């Protein structure tokens, strides 16, 4: 993995040592270059993880997420090239430093071969994310939103820390390989169930299921555009990545305790998407949408089925790219109009014709229509869930109905209708925005051709 | 006065200065090159060139090998006149059945 | 009702409110030596005798 981390860390001084104006140029060029190198990880051997060293390893589950993260890295730079602009040099240099540090932690986290080593870097991402949210956040309530973020995830993560160190004391090493091979059936005793609760709550906070999901409306809305994409496209899946990794040592205790979180999530996605059906803030609407799609994964992995995991990774990658996209779209609208209310800037297709097609494709992907990855992700969850319980399709099927309505609601309210009369500052779309979004949408269309790369480790 | 501040600035439209602005920087030379590098090392070098990389990656999960090995296995099993596949995987000859 | 009225007042606000009241008098003493050292007197007495730490 040192072919990726070492360039990434070494990339940080380069940004600090670039000229006043060339900072965005050099950083974007090599960040893409890192993404190209990271693409080499997509080759996964037959039935064994690509173990590079004791510290780092990768399999058919980490590699699709790693390349997504590195490929994401230039995208926050592009989306922030405009709202930052009028700032002192060092503050902009610091902003890039936070992003690169944040991406660097993610690369190490997904490749961590020790569950403890996972745990440090898994929450080490909190320090840069909190910095971006509170420092450059363009609103007032970012301070309370930042507090809601870290305290929610840390309150989940602390009981985790006690859990793994206990497993270390009982079974020596916490290595991901040795946990799988030397796995033992957990009992149903009241001691093990609290171990099960601790081993799951930390991951399910950044998953968030229904209930403990109230930093999602807070963190995303009042955050910089770069932060909104990062904390909706990667670290949400980072919390998920633990579940597939850590469920290896929670069987058969999953089935008995599966119900409370299954029932909370499965009813949740209807409730959350119902909130999506009528929202006043566009960014909030996209934020709640991420909860619904993420809740689809929570039921998915915690059913613990081959087909469930295979669709879980596919939905994860697809949703992250889509959620990252729509946040660009909201930011582009917000930058011009300086507001977030959806009905405030109705009728945008007439003025900006390209932005409609991007918004059409963005919502179309959120529709989870075939053959796009979102549909081939949700469909596999449906099949796995239906086999688990025949009455699942009543709930999760109804979601696609509710999902369709709100996912097209912003299309009607913003693009179609009538251009708002009093707004007269909507200039023609900058080629940066359109280029940024093409880097979001059509790579998804490629990935439709070859789903097996992201279909997960169970393919 | 309440506070001695400055009025909120105005959104500097990048086009009135230079009409061919690319939404990357106020200086025409840098932004034009910014467009050059984000594109070149974007769609072509990473997205298009990297596409053929993952498109032409060697056999994933040994998928081709799996069937190729399978075809021979059927050939003996079909011809020998025995069930195509036994109900058990670890055949119980070398198993120590409890009790 | 659920999301931003109850789900924020069950876990987040209640714990904030609980931490609020406790921090109210923990941080608000009177600064009198008499009250302090008297609180020492119980603490020493209750420590040896009634938590039975001497046993």
């Amino acid at each position: 993995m040192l072919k990726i981390i070492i360039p990434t860390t070494m990339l940080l001084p380069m940004t600090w040592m670039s000229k006043h104006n060339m900072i965005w140029i050099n950083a974007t060029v090599h960040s893409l270059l890192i993404s190209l190198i990271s693409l080499s990880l997509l080759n996964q051997l037959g039935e064994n993880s690509l173990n590079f060293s004791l510290t780092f390893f990768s399999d058919s589950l980490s590699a699709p997420l790693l390349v997504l993260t590195t490929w994401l890295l230039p995208l926050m730079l592009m989306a922030s090239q405009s709202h930052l602009s009028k700032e002192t040099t060092t503050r902009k240099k610091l902003y890039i430093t936070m992003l690169i540090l944040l991406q660097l932690f993610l690369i190490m986290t997904f490749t961590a071969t020790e569950l403890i080593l996972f745990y440090i870097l898994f929450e080490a991402t909190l320090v840069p994310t909190l910095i971006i949210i509170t420092r450059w956040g363009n609103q007032t309530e970012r301070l309370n939103a930042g507090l809601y973020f870290l305290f929610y995830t840390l309150a989940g993560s602390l009981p985790l820390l006690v859990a793994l160190v206990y497993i270390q004391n009982t079974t020596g090493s916490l290595n991901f390989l040795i946990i799988h091979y030397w796995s033992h059936p957990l009992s149903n005793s009241w001691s093990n169930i609290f171990m099960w609760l601790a081993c799951i709550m930390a991951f399910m906070v950044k998953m968030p299921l229904y209930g403990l999901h109230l930093w999602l409306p807070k963190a995303h809305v009042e955050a910089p555009i770069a932060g909104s994409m990062v904390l909706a496209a990667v670290l949400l899946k980072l919390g998920g990545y633990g579940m597939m990794r850590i469920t290896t040592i929670l069987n058969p205790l999953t089935n008995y305790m599966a119900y409370p979180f299954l029932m909370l999530s499965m009813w949740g996605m209807i409730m959350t998407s119902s909130i999506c059906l009528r929202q006043t803030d566009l960014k909030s609407l996209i934020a709640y949408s991420s909860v619904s799609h993420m809740a689809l994964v929570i039921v998915a992995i915690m059913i613990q089925t081959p087909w469930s995991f295979m669709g879980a990774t596919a939905l994860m990658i697809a949703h992250g790219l889509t959620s990252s996209m729509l946040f660009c779209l909201a930011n582009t609208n917000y930058e011009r109009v300086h507001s977030r209310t959806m009905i405030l800037a109705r009728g945008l297709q007439t003025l900006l014709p390209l932005m409609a097609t991007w918004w059409l494709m963005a919502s179309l992907t959120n529709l989870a229509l075939p053959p796009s990855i979102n549909l081939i992700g949700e469909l596999f969850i449906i099949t796995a869930s239906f086999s688990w319980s025949n009455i699942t399709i009543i709930l999760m099927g109804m979601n696609m109905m509710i999902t369709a309505l709100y996912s097209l609601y912003m299309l009607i309210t913003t693009q179609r209708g009538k251009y708002t009369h009093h707004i007269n500052n909507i200039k023609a779309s900058f080629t940066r925005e359109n280029a940024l979004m093409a880097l979001h949408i059509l790579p998804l269309l490629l990935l439709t051709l070859n789903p097996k790369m992201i279909l997960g480790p169970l393919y | 006065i309440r506070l001695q501040e400055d009025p909120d600035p105005e959104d500097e439209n990048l086009y009135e200065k230079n009409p061919d602005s690319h939404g990357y920087d106020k200086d025409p030379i840098v932004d034009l090159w910014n467009m050059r590098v984000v594109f070149f090392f974007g769609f072509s070098i990473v997205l298009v060139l990297g596409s053929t990389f993952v498109a032409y990656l060697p056999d994933y999960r040994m998928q081709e090998w799996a069937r190729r090995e399978a075809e021979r296995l059927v050939k003996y099993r079909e011809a020998n006149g025995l069930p195509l596949m036994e109900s058990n995987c670890f055949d119980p000859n070398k198993i120590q059945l409890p009790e | 009702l659920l999301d931003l009225i109850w789900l924020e007042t069950i876990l987040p606000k209640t714990t904030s409110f609980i931490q609020m009241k406790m921090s109210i008098m923990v941080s608000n003493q009177k600064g009198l030596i008499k009250l302090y050292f008297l609180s020492f007197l119980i603490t020493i007495m209750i420590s040896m005798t009634l938590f039975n730490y001497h046993e």
């Binding site: 609103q139 007032t140 | 600035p9 | 109210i24």
Partner: peptide, 26 residues
Amino acid sequence: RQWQPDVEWAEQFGGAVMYPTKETAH
């Protein structure tokens, strides 16, 4: 520009006791 704390925000973090009450009114 992004929101920045005003004088009223400072007065929040500006009392003798950060969370005022009747016992600490004076």
